[model samples]
Target: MTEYKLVVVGAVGVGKSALTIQLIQNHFVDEYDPTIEDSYRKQVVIDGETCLLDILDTAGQEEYSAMRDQYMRTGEGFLCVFAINNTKSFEDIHHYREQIKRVKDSEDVPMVLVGNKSDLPSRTVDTKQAQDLARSYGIPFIETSAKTRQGVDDAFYTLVREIRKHKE
Candidate 1:
């Protein structure tokens, strides 16, 4: 395929932007120009095939409510993110996942669940809960720290692999 459509969906202040930018930039930062919708492109090889990752870095829930279905329809896969320190953010994960599936008109969407901010010293959302949720959805789950750059690539790369699997 020439391009892979990917979307990063999560609640406000959940570090969705941070994680997307980190994946594109390969370096973390503290500042960004917040916007309604931002798209990024990355060319890489996954599982021995070259791919151009066409990504949308979507805003939080209330802010970009209008852009939801538009991007969701275009996205071939998704990285659903929630901050580890916030349980409320974790709660929204289900809604986002459901919405994506609904917009795609299919239950088996290529999506990955992510718990960001994992490097922080404290955690309110346990890893087991996230994994169990992912298990129920039949998707992959990961804990990532956009700041430290750990697991950032892991989450995105895994989604691309899932995207590949879904086509068959």
Candidate 2:
């Protein structure tokens, strides 16, 4: 068994906390609170091995811009999430990714590109487009709807595996 800390991040109303909550609690939160920041701990089996995943969820609101540096510094991996229906949120993923790399002082830190709200029929950031960006970044991409509890586990499990590859 191994322990890992991951960060959940996004630019707009991509529901950063929603994704993490769904993963740990298996339920949807009806309300959206942008200013909320909370850390969670969960142990689950991944790839037939038990692992501990500690995650902090936060949004891209500018008030917390100064706070994310510490999160980036401590987290072993990240989930760069964006709302599928929000083009601006998709655009902000680039900034989040770059900042993580900058803080970690490595261009190849473990990360996953996540497109949340996949259950929504109306979409702005398509799968192919998100995949294209992830391909260019040399990272895996996944789509999840925290509201529906789809693809939530895979996204976090994927990051844990990514961290395995770059173990120090």
Candidate 3:
């Protein structure tokens, strides 16, 4: 089994925990309060490959912005998240990338830009905008629906595949 340290990061209320839990447990915990500051680590088997996953679901509050760099420093790779229903969340990816760069001394850290919560159609951030931004950063972009499990596995699987390919 291969081990990979995967981090899920984004602004608060952007559905990081929702996406993580759905991917790991395949169940959604609705009506969640956004006041918690915590992270979860677990082992998962992806496509018969095992990986040690550690996710830092940082508080989206402005006060926590200063600690973003420190939190991201321990990550080997990242799944930068943004809510498909929130334009602000999508727009915040720039800040997230900048913070990651500060912690990642090398430019080779693999990352995937995820547009989460595609399940919600009434309130949606423009997909093209997110895709264009991700392209600008030279990262792959995927829209996921944690509630429906759409693209959830594909996102993580793609990330691991890319990481493994880079190692070869």
Candidate 4:
């Protein structure tokens, strides 16, 4: 089977781990504990082909920032996530994207801009602004809620599809 490496990144409390776990394990976590790094493997069928996905759910803390390059180097695709309720987290996404491009030495890397925590009512970032930023970067933008399991699968599937497209 074809294997792909994926990295999920974002600011702390932005639901990166929640989203990853929801997709891989079909479970929702209701806590905001930080993660150092976690690896997960799963088989998924996309477009009639079965493939293995190796996911690296990364820590968003600045203390763990040094490991970003290593993850970027190993990942074939990325999910640059941000919480809609936290504007600072949304703003920091550019840094993640820049780091990925620098480490990969390619501006054409496959990725998606994810606005997580869509289930929350108090959103600080506007959807249009997020969509515009994603459009400027030439990447797809998706909003997901890990708690309610809304659009979670679509986000992962979209990233995987983009990764496959980039490979071709």
Candidate 5:
């Protein structure tokens, strides 16, 4: 089986951990506890090919800035997530993208722009803006809700597909 490393990144309270947890465990978390750094391993089959995915759910705090480069370097693909209710979180995605490009030394790195917390009642970042930003980066854009498990699987699957395509 092939192995892939995927990293999830975003601002604090942007549901990065929630999305990762949902993807790995098939459950949603309601509490808000800040994550330091966590990794999960799972075997999945895509297009009849068995593959192992190692996912890193990273801390969003500024104190963890030093480790961002390492994560970017190790990841085969990235899920650049942001909460739809927070515009600042959405804006931070650009910084993450730049860091990944700088660390990987490749502008064509496989990545997906994920707008999390789509089920929230209030949203500051509109879909058009997020879509436009993703388009500018030449990456796929998706919206996910960890609470309802909406688009959660799609986000990860999309990144995995991109990773496979990039490797090919």
Candidate 6:
């Protein structure tokens, strides 16, 4: 099976880890200890394909820039997550993109911008902002909720399709 590394990154509490858990395992663990390490990894298989996905959930702390950069360097694709209920987390995606670009040093890297926390009624980051930012950066954007399993697979599956199309 072909293997690929996908990195999940964003500000803390933006649900990067949660998205990874839901997408990879089809289960959600509501309570989580704050991430202290730079990298966490898991494996998943794409349906009807021989690709084995290695998903890395990185600590979103920008303070540890070097560590985060190192973790991101291992990425074949990036899942840039943001919380719909948190403006700061959404805004932080731009900074994350910059960081990823610095590490990737390539404009062709596949990226998926995800707006999470859709189950919440009170949203600070709207769909328009997510769409615009993603478009400006030339990436696919979708709103998701790990809590409800809404749009979770859509985001990851779309990335997989793109990667296959580009032979990346």
- Candidate closest to the true structure, highest lDDT: 4
> Backbone clashes in each candidate structure, one number apiece?
0, 0, 1, 0, 0, 0
Off by over 4 Å in 1: 61-64
Once fitted onto the true fold, the runs of candidate 2 whose alpha carbons sit more than 4 angstroms away are none
Cα lDDT, all candidates: 0.73, 0.75, 0.71, 0.79, 0.76, 0.71
User: Estimated TM-score per prediction?
Assistant: 0.88, 0.88, 0.83, 0.91, 0.90, 0.85
Please list all clashing residue pairs in model 1, or write none if there are none: none
Candidate 4, residues 30-109, lDDT tens digits: the string is: 78777776678889888778888878787777775566665567777676778877789877877777777888888897
Instruction: Give Cα distance to truth, residue 93, candidate 6, Å.
Output: 1.5
lDDT of 4: 0.79
What TM-score quantifies how close candidate 6 is to the native fold? 0.85
Mind giving the per-residue lDDT tens digits that candidate 6 earns over 18-123? Answer: 7666765667877765665433344445667656776766666557666765656677877677786678876677676677778878777666777778888898
RMSD of each: 1.9, 1.9, 2.4, 1.6, 1.7, 2.4
TM-score of 3: 0.83
Rank candidates, TM-score, best first: 4, 5, 1, 2, 6, 3
Ranked by lDDT, the better of candidates 4 and 6 is: 4
For model 1, give the 10-residue run with minimal summed lDDT. 63-72
Query: What is the Cα-based TM-score of model 2?
Result: 0.88
Task: Count steric clashes of candidate 1.
Answer: 0
**N/CA/C clash count, model 3:** 1
Q: Give the alpha carbon lDDT tens digit for every residue of 47-74 in model 1.
A: 8888888777766647546756665677
lDDT of 5 at 72: 59
How many clashes would you count in candidate 6? 0
Candidate 5 lDDT by residue in tens digits, 29-124? 768887776678888877778788888777777785667665557777576777867778766776776777788888877777777777778988
lDDT per residue as tens, model 2, 1-168: 676776767765666776676778776686888755666878889888988777777655777567666555887767677886778886677777677778888887777777778788888877798899889999888877678777877776777777788885
True lDDT of residue 67, candidate 3 = 64
